[PDB]
Amino acid sequence: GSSGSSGLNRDSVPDNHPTKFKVTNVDDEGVELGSGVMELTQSELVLHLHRREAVRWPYLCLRRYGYDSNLFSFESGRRCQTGQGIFAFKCSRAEEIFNLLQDLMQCNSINVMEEPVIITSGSSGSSGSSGSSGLFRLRHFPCGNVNYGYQQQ
C-alpha cells in the first residue's frame, strides 16, 4: 500500500475530471483493446471514441453493474446499439464511475426498497462466433461487486 505521483501533464483534460472519465475496453484476459472517454448524463450512459460514432446505454436497460479497484463493468439489455452483453473497461477512477452511475439512475422518479440477496444460477453451456459489430462482449462478469438497476414484475 503506497501513494503515487504524476511525473508530467501536457493535455487540456484534467486527471480529476468529475464527469468525463478516461477508459480502456478489455477482453476476457484483461488485454487493452482500445481507448475512449466515458460520459454520464442525467439521461443515459455515453462513451466517446474515435471517428466511429459514440456509444450509448440507457440506465433503464442496465439490469446490473459493478466495479473493482481498477476496473468498471456492466450488463446492457437487448434494446441498445451494441446488443445484449457484458462490457468492461480499465479505469483508476472506476469507483467514482460506479457511484455516479447509481446516483444519476436514482435521480429519476422510481420506487425502491430493501430486499435479501438470493443465490443466482448459471447456464448449461453455450458458444458461437463473431456476428454484429461493437465493443468486446464478455462471457462472464469480471467485477467482484454487483449492484442492480431498474426493477419491475
UniProtKB/Swiss-Prot annotation:
Record PTM: Phosphorylated by ULK2 in vitro. Phosphorylated on tyrosine residues upon stimulation by BFGF or NGFB.
Name of the protein: Fibroblast growth factor receptor substrate 3
Organism: Homo sapiens
Assembly and interaction partners: Binds NTRK1. Binds FGFR1, NGFR, GRB2, PTPN11 and ERK2.
Residue range from the parent sequence: 8 to 120 of 492
Functional note: Adapter protein that links FGF and NGF receptors to downstream signaling pathways. Involved in the activation of MAP kinases. Down-regulates ERK2 signaling by interfering with the phosphorylation and nuclear translocation of ERK2.
Domain of life: Eukaryota
Localization in the cell: Membrane
Domain IRS-type PTB span(s) in chain numbering: 13-115
